[PDB]
Design a protein around this ligand. Structure first.
Ligand code: HEM
Ligand SMILES: COc1cc([N+](=O)[O-])ccc1O
Length: 137
């Protein structure tokens, strides 16, 4: 289930992070407005850059912290507030997060693996709600 999925993801964090982020960018190419330094690069061109693996790992590490601190796939309001208040997230609205989680769920469903995709889809919806409650537009 969800807890075991956090363990699976953490076990190969950088690899899963890169592949999920790429699934996101490729599903929603307009989302690349937020990642101007990744424009004009294929998946393997991105993965080769140490900065890409470094960024994606730090992002997914925080995502896994947030997931692990959730109760029944409902994240803490404090974690939602951290995500709203991060300077790096100043342009963002809840739809940016919605899309990330639609891509993450789709990736899990297409994986050969027994991820609890419905738990991830609830977690994304609950995180969107929590972001809104913590003041994201
Ligand atoms: C639960 C979801 C998310 C988590 C945990 C998260 C976490 C983080 C973290 C930790 C950083 C700093 C990374 C580092 O040290 O290298 C970061 C940067 C950033 N995040 Fe997020 N993020 C999330 C979702 C999003 C979404 C949906 C977007 C936009 C679609 C976004 C846009 C950014 C951008 C633009 C930066 C700045 C990257 C740069 O320096 O070039 N994040 N995020
Ligand atoms: C949508 O923002 C991100 C998401 C991920 N990821 O692994 O889901 C990595 C880096 C990011 O900037």
């Amino acid at each position: 289930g969800f807890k075991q999925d956090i363990a699976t993801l953490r076990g190969d964090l950088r690899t899963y992070a890169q592949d999920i982020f790429l699934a996101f960018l490729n599903k929603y190419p307009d989302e690349k407005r937020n990642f101007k330094n990744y424009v004009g690069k294929s998946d393997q061109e991105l993965k080769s850059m140490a900065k890409f693996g470094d960024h994606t790992e730090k992002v997914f590490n925080l995502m896994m912290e947030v997931a692990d601190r959730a109760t029944d796939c409902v994240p803490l309001a404090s974690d939602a507030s951290t995500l709203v208040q991060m300077k790096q997230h100043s342009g963002l609205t809840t739809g940016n997060f919605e899309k990330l989680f639609v891509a993450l769920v789709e990736y899990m469903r297409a994986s050969g693996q027994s991820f609890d995709s419905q738990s991830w889809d609830r977690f994304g919806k609950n995180l969107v709600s929590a972001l809104s409650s913590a003041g994201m537009k």
